[PDB]
Design an enzyme around this catalytic site. Structure first.
Site, PDB file in Angstrom:
ATOM      1  N   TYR A  27       0.825  -1.202   0.000  1.00 28.34           N
ATOM      2  CA  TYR A  27       0.000   0.000   0.000  1.00 28.34           C
ATOM      3  C   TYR A  27       0.865   1.260   0.000  1.00 28.34           C
ATOM      4  CZ  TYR A  27      -4.008   2.937   1.535  1.00 28.34           C
ATOM      5  OH  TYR A  27      -5.048   3.835   1.626  1.00 28.34           O
TER       6      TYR A  27
ATOM      7  N   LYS B  84      -1.716  -1.307  -3.994  1.00 29.83           N
ATOM      8  CA  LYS B  84      -2.778  -0.309  -3.964  1.00 29.83           C
ATOM      9  C   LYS B  84      -1.952   0.953  -4.127  1.00 29.83           C
ATOM     10  CE  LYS B  84      -6.384   2.298  -1.705  1.00 29.83           C
ATOM     11  NZ  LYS B  84      -7.013   2.861  -0.478  1.00 29.83           N
TER      12      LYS B  84
END
Lengths: 293, 294, 295, 296
Positions: C136, C164
């Site tokens: 992330y 992400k």
């Protein structure tokens, strides 16, 4: 010897934005009269970046006529272009300046190697005049590392560094690595702290109207009078607080105008005029400073 | 009395399994006291509080209090991103008898200034009388406050000090000018001398754990108008700081403290990694230098 | 789907007036998202107000969401904490609850070296016991600014199956796709979803999916069919909404809309998050009406 | 068509000779080269033309020569921006005299000007452009001027402003600008996100790399217009492989080098402080030139 407290000279203009020669001469004499150690000409404060090469040369020549031999003279010849910087450096030599200086070229992102060659080329054209490297990330957008600054200040022909940075850890590190380097504190508002950290002098725009206060801080610290050093810095900062609100260059020019030094307090466009709401304070400041000394 | 002075930002000694090493924690507290430190700032960045649970932070507060309450000033950093969690620690600090609480501006999520203000208000309420030390540390929190906002925070009801971890000494002077009676701690050890000259009246730092007397020496020197001594001491502190930044500050300090026989195991909690072995020789020599110097 | 590609809502955590988890509302929100046709849920991240939640509270949410959606939609558990050990605990719980993957934001506040970040992910992957890791990247909130080379190294660590990417740099988005043809790549900023997909993302995870996930699915479909105009119009509508949510405060604004949609009982966020400014209620209520009719 | 500023326009490079002086022959060849590849127009005197290491007379000389070569054939935008308002006004007046279709000015830099000062700067130049539409130029990465959306909205709505060159990778802002100004000519500034920029709301673009492969960007415009996403992505990807290289070699010098290999520019030098291209990159640059010529 380049160590000292030197004013970053302003460039007086007339109502049509052209150089006001008489006021320029008056400002130079005004600075000499207040005991300034020297003048840094053609830098940010001289509005050099809104002037042509010939205009910058004209200012350099006039200042030399007025002050050569009386006080130290440093010519800021920096331009984004190396060729242009070299031309100004050669002129500075011809006019008799004591040294040249150049801000790290900006706008375009240049590699450190390109920055180094830039300085070497200017140093070559200065033909003997020592170079004062100019570090001012806030305006240039160039953020040099300590290693890079170390490399620049050790280049052949470099005799000083104007450090316009509020990072006093770096200031101490530079002094530690270079015991004999002339190191000018660039931000007037931390002058006292900058000297304590390692700077052995300074160059600033506000010196034009109260240079004696900075000379006073040098003396105070030299004598161990921390109390006096702080009081003087505090007073300098009350003034800087105001100038930042009014616009520094135009604020200073307005004060100098009320002191009858500068005929017209205008800066060149895009710099705008001073907001009339600040005139009461600027007038009062001029009065205060004239009485003070 | 007051909260002015030189306060060490206490480290949290851990054992080989990253569990609190109570014995070493106690030794470190006493070690700081013997150095002549004015107080301790507990549970902040340096205590690795942000990789500790609330229960673990409370445990450290309680033990430090047992060891130093009544001997030196004790400031408990109870700040968390969560207001409720911060309040719990505030209540505990009061319970343990600390002299004041402190809280870093809540981070990660972008909070409005009004939200930051209410956050401090809520913690002050739970502090039940203990004065609040606002903590401005933009480099780590990512929260960039304006001078106006800082002025507002330090004048909130219940606030009695500000730990200023900022290298902007113009702002340091502006804060002092606007608040002549405010307790103002210089946060960056590397500019301590200049920070005091600008207006700070004390300081809180991680490196005080191994050479707090040097910082006390700077305060004395400036007090006596001895500029050269102040500069020389700062230079020496910076030679150490140069090294610590290379080795990693917390682990470098713990390693020096280990060689000083204060801490048993000099490790930090993951994700913090171990000290690179190539730095041990320098860290050992430093430990020896400091011990002989002191 | 036998992969993690798709449009996943970053789940919000409904609280009651006492700021305690509102289990009933959480369950309703999970079901509401499923009914919207969402491909999955990203649980325990920024949007779930995980950073103002204790480890056990985060775990409780993971358990409940699993009870509600396991086997129906993909479930990604964000187990990231500054502490590696704490992140590992949540990873183990996610595995036990049957999540499809775990995820972790680059540890923040303290300035960790890249090597430390790498070891952090490796440790969490170990505790995930088989579940793929979704790295992330969210520099705006984490303060961690990774270079392209560092990102390439992270996404290729053993056990990493996706990224992400909450970054508005679509040059980097394209470079990541170019270097990793098969990587699952989620667009993180809802406001540039269409452009993100065009640049190389093959899905997305976002907070606003909770109230209008079908719009994002519509954008995916439109682009898949070469209907540029429809994709743009949908993105424009999403941005009109995002404009409002940024003014009102995103999480509380979303929760308020959900309250008007009869999904969440109390639209409160945990302190230091403040209440919504009453002056925005009319617009938020109107938006809720519009979205419900739009369905 | 007569006054439409929308389109794909190359940010023109300024060819120099071995002595760093303007190479007129190569400048004319470069203008023709751009026209020949179907470019919609040229943005002259901007960052890419190395205007900030040129004097005012040198910038005017380039403007005059480009007009002689392309006036009437393609659109011509004169970037007249300088830090100084007066210098900018001089260039604006020359641009009108030479027959340019529009003028443009980067937000004045170095000194921290207030927003009101920026606004007056644009108004003054617009006055001197006497009729030529103004293209506001937002490029924070180089200027250091970070404008808010409200400020950009204020600037693009000033009387006389007909477009904005948006050199920003923030595509949320790109969409917001398009939403607030449906008729505004909006040029995507970063070549590496051209496709996504158009999707977000830009209706054209201005870029340095258009000099060597402008047809690819026109290809992306066509692809998106036809709903051919695969082709649009493929082209953007190929453009980015090139941009990856140019960023490593140095953009302007890398471009000049490719153009030299394409027999357009005699000497591929940039002015100091710009250094020469590192020889280790010549193999890729020569191969790229060959590929582009094969393609064209």
């Amino acid at each position: 010897n380049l160590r000292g407290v030197m004013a970053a000279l302003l460039t007086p203009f007339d109502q049509q934005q052209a150089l006001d020669k008489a006021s320029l001469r008056r400002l130079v004499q005004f600075n000499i009269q207040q005991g300034i150690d020297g003048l840094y000409v053609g830098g940010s404060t001289g509005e050099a970046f809104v002037q042509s090469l010939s205009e910058r040369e004209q200012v350099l020549e006039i200042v030399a006529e007025e002050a050569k031999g009386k006080i130290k003279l440093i010519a800021h010849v920096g331009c984004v272009s190396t060729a242009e910087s070299q031309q100004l450096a050669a002129s500075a030599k011809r006019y008799g300046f004591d040294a040249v200086s150049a801000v790290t070229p900006f706008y375009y992102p240049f590699s450190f190697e390109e920055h180094c060659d830039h300085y070497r080329a200017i140093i070559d054209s200065a033909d003997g005049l020592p170079m004062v490297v100019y570090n001012i990330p806030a305006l240039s957008g160039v953020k040099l590392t300590l290693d890079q600054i170390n490399t620049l200040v050790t280049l052949p022909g470099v005799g000083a560094l104007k450090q316009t940075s509020g990072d006093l850890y770096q200031m101490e590190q530079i002094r530690r690595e270079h015991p004999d380097l002339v190191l000018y504190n660039g931000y007037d508002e931390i002058f006292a702290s900058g000297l304590l950290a390692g700077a052995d002098g300074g160059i600033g725009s506000t010196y034009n109207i109260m240079g004696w206060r900075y000379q006073g801080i040098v003396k105070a610290l030299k004598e161990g009078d921390i109390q006096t050093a702080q009081k003087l810095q505090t007073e300098c900062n009350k003034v800087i607080d105001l100038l930042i609100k009014t616009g520094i260059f135009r604020g200073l020019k307005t004060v100098l105008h009320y002191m009858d030094v500068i005929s017209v307090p205008l800066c060149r466009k895009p710099f705008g005029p001073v907001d009339e709401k600040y005139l009461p304070e600027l007038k009062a400041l001029a009065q205060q400073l004239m009485q003070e000394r």
